[PDB]
């Protein structure tokens, strides 16, 4: 099944490879290879984001 996570707060990347997002955004989860940094997709963009900034969605 495809699992989505929803953004609790705005995240502004401090480094390259990180996924920017606004509160409300629904991110497709690609993986949780790092308990703190999950990798995902938001439309065309892809990158890692902090797991504490999101909650399950779908």
């Amino acid at each position: 099944e495809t699992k989505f996570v929803q953004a609790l707060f705005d995240f502004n990347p401090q480094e390259s490879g990180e996924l920017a997002f606004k509160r409300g955004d629904v991110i497709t989860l690609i993986n949780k290879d790092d308990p703190n940094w999950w990798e995902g997709q938001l439309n065309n963009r892809r990158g890692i984001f902090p797991s504490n900034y999101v909650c399950p969605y779908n």
Binding site: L8, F9, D10, F11, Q14, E15, N36, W37, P50, S51, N52, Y53
Partner: peptide
């Protein structure tokens, strides 16, 4: 927003 996890 909480601090960003150990980068």
């Amino acid at each position: 927003p909480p601090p960003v996890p150990p980068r």
